Design a protein around this ligand. Structure first.
Ligand SMILES: *[C@@H]1O[C@H](CO)[C@@H](O[C@@H]2O[C@H](CO)[C@@H](O)[C@H](O)[C@H]2NC(C)=O)[C@H](O)[C@H]1NC(C)=O
Ligand SMILES: *[C@@H]1O[C@H](CO)[C@@H](O[C@@H]2O[C@H](CO)[C@@H](O)[C@H](O)[C@H]2NC(C)=O)[C@H](O)[C@H]1NC(C)=O
Ligand SMILES: *[C@@H]1O[C@H](CO)[C@@H](O)[C@H](O)[C@H]1NC(C)=O
Ligand SMILES: *[C@@H]1O[C@H](CO)[C@@H](O)[C@H](O)[C@H]1NC(C)=O
Lengths: 443, 192
């Protein structure tokens, strides 16, 4: 009843209660959405050439007995997701010394799946996906010290109580390309927690390319203690989007915006990109980013930013890209973008902007891309763009441009001379003609 | 090469369970099996599959599809199996399956289909398995007459392998078999 196409066997939703007879040469088999209640050593006896196997989403309670995969020395990818109440014997993965990818998302598994010997046979494991289980503590057993190519771990949507040095002892020495700790709550790691000093550095002797800590609240007082704790950890990309407790929010008193101490622990981390989007930052305070001395890209999109204080960007000597889209800046002035000499891309779209100050973009000689679209600009000051000598692209559309003369004289002429740079089309309010086409009778 | 979010083996490309909001680009034209199940795909771009002329299996179950773009499958003349279960399909475009002469398995159960457009299955000469259960079929509407006439003529291939059979294609609210509705009981005015 399976559909066999070359080396592929598709057995999706066939009402199967056991592994069916298949040609012995197939290397990809999909057994998802069937009613297999148990896998044992006889299950894949006639399929030793397997490289890619999916047995997702059986009816609840799939049991995988010892040595089910013994003999599958060619198996590289094993996906077993959405098996509700998945039952694993401790030798379930015997023989999978060459496996590289294992996915066990939404299987009601707990922390013993990492601390027990389940993954002990998996010496070649590189990527482990454990999303949306019941893992309350991350405590890898000692055999992880010898898993030399293990570099991707996804624990998103597990309610992890806390992460501490002694928990992650057996990840020390590792370099993760991706450590995804998104929406894991960390409820115990609050500002009052007595465990902070004992917690030490969970990422001691550990480097990370992308650290995803999004969706975890990260109230300022918490972020500060957390980054103090992991100080010195080499992180190239830090993801902290949807930090719903981060920032003081729109007109409020409870929570605080980050300040010059909040991220001090990341001082020596070598962070290149930082994502703080979809949080609730209201004001950018002075030197709040001054410890990101290697940072090249920073997004603050979709916050509640109304204010940028003097020297908010102090110390950002390498920043090339700044995304401030979908905030509430309302008006731009010269002081606001000081200390950004190397900036090449600036996104100010969707900010309810009605005014640009005279020297707004003065200190940005290397700016290549400037987005000002979807605001409320009726006009700009004369000469506002003349010092942007590196400029390649500009967005000015979806603004209610006032095309009366001689008010529109500078902008219409500038947009015409620089027509190859304009992305989209700025339009006169009322008439709807391109601003670039207006020629004022005088100047 | 294999798309970033995807895993490849032979002529198989599996992009399942990757929180995808759209179909990945750069899918090799040699692809015979494409898996996009268990993602957050909400819409398909018109002609997104035109490149994959060698596709025989397209798996799209457990996404957030509400409808399909017209002629989206017309290049896929070698398509054998098509999986659409657990989406939110409210309607199918006229003649989306017309080119699928070799299609043996069509899986449409657990969606939000009220009806099937006239002649939608007429070109499916190779059809062995079709699943249509768990849909709110509007039996008061007169457009259901095609589905009625078709499933009563091909009842052996409807919901087989203990999926209820032709009787598991049920009416919305009354839970009556669709094959048992009369033309007199239906009306063009009760069509939304
Ligand atoms: C499944 O395999 C596990 C591990 O291979 C077995 O547990 C081991 O049994 C030996 C005795 O033969 C003990 O010395 C080890 O300490 C056990 N390991 C653990 C982690 O408990 C287990 O008995 C096997 N179960 C079945 C039903 O065969
Ligand atoms: C700055 O961030 C915003 C939001 O993260 C980016 O917005 C996306 O922009 C593209 C086209 O510009 C849209 O198709 C997407 O829908 C937007 N996403 C959202 C969530 O609104 C924006 O592109 C970023 N700007 C730069 C220059 O990278
Ligand atoms: C293995 O599983 C199959 C199907 O579930 C069963 O028929 C067989 O008896 C099992 N064998 C052992 C040794 O458990
Ligand atoms: C861990 O420490 C050792 C010894 O100090 C060092 O050689 C190694 O590079 C470190 N590894 C990481 C990933 O930081």
């Amino acid at each position: 009843e399976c559909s066999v196409i070359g080396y592929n066997a598709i057995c999706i939703n066939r009402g199967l209660h056991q592994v069916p007879e298949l040609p012995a040469h197939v290397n990809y088999v999909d057994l998802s959405l069937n009613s297999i209640a148990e896998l044992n050593e006889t299950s894949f006896s006639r399929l030793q050439d397997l490289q890619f196997l999916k047995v997702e989403q059986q009816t609840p309670g799939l049991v995988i007995r010892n040595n089910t995969f013994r003999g599958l020395s060619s198996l590289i990818i094993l996906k077993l997701d959405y098996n509700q109440f998945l039952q694993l014997e401790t030798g379930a993965f015997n023989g999978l010394a060459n496996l590289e990818v294992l996915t066990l998302t939404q299987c009601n598994l707990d922390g013993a799946v990492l601390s027990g010997n389940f993954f002990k046979p998996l010496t070649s494991l590189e990527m482990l996906v454990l999303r949306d289980n019941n893992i309350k503590k991350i405590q890898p057993a000692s055999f992880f010290l010898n898993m030399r190519r293990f570099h991707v771990l996804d624990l998103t949507f597990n309610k992890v109580k806390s992460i501490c040095e002694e928990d992650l002892l057996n990840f020390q020495g590792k370099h993760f390309t991706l450590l995804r700790l998104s929406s894991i709550t960390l409820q115990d790691m609050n500002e009052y927690w007595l465990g902070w000093e004992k917690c030490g550095n969970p990422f001691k002797n550990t480097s990370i390319t992308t650290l995803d800590l999004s969706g975890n609240g990260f109230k300022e007082s918490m972020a500060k203690r957390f980054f103090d704790a992991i100080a010195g950890t080499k992180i190239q990309s830090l993801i902290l989007s949807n930090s719903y407790n981060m920032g003081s929010s729109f007109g409020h008193t409870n929570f605080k915006d980050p300040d010059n101490f909040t991220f001090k622990g990341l001082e020596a981390s070598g962070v290149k990109t930082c994502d703080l989007s979809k949080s609730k930052i209201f004001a950018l305070l002075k030197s709040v980013f001054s410890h990101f001395t290697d940072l090249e890209q920073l997004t603050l999109a979709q916050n509640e930013i109304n204010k940028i204080d003097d020297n908010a960007f102090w110390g950002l000597t390498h920043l090339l890209k700044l995304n401030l889209s979908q905030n509430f800046l309302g008006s731009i002035d010269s002081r606001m973008f000081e200390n950004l000499d190397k900036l090449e891309v600036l996104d100010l779209s969707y900010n309810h902007i009605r005014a640009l100050g005279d020297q707004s973009f003065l200190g940005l000689p290397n700016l290549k891309e400037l987005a000002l679209d979807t605001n409320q600009l009726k006009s700009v000051p004369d000469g506002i763009f003349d010092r942007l000598t590196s400029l390649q692209k500009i967005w000015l559309h979806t603004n209610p441009w006032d095309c009366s003369c001689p008010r529109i004289d500078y902008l219409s002429r500038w947009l015409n001379k620089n027509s190859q740079k304009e992305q989209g089309s700025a339009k006169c309010s009322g008439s709807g003609k391109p601003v670039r086409s207006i020629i004022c009778p005088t100047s | 090469a294999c798309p970033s979010q995807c895993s490849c083996s032979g002529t198989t490309v599996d992009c399942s369970g990757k929180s995808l909001a759209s179909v990945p680009t750069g899918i090799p034209t040699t692809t015979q099996v494409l898996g996009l199940s268990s993602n957050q795909i909400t819409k398909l771009e018109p002609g997104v599959f035109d490149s994959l002329v060698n596709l025989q299996i397209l798996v799209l179950y457990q996404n957030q599809l509400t409808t399909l773009p017209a002629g989206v499958f017309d290049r896929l003349i070698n398509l054998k199996e098509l999986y659409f279960s657990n989406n939110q399909l409210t309607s199918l475009p006229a003649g989306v399956f017309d080119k699928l002469t070799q299609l043996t398995r069509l899986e449409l159960q657990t969606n939000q289909l009220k009806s099937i457009p006239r002649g939608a299955f007429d070109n499916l000469k190779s059809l062995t398995n079709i699943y249509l259960f768990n849909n709110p079929w509007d039996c008061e509407c007169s457009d259901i007459l095609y589905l009625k006439n078709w499933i009563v003529q091909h009842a052996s291939i409807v919901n087989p392998d203990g999926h209820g059979g032709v009787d598991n294609v049920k009416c919305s609210g009354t839970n009556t078999p669709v094959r048992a509705v009369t033309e007199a009981s239906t009306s063009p005015s009760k069509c939304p």
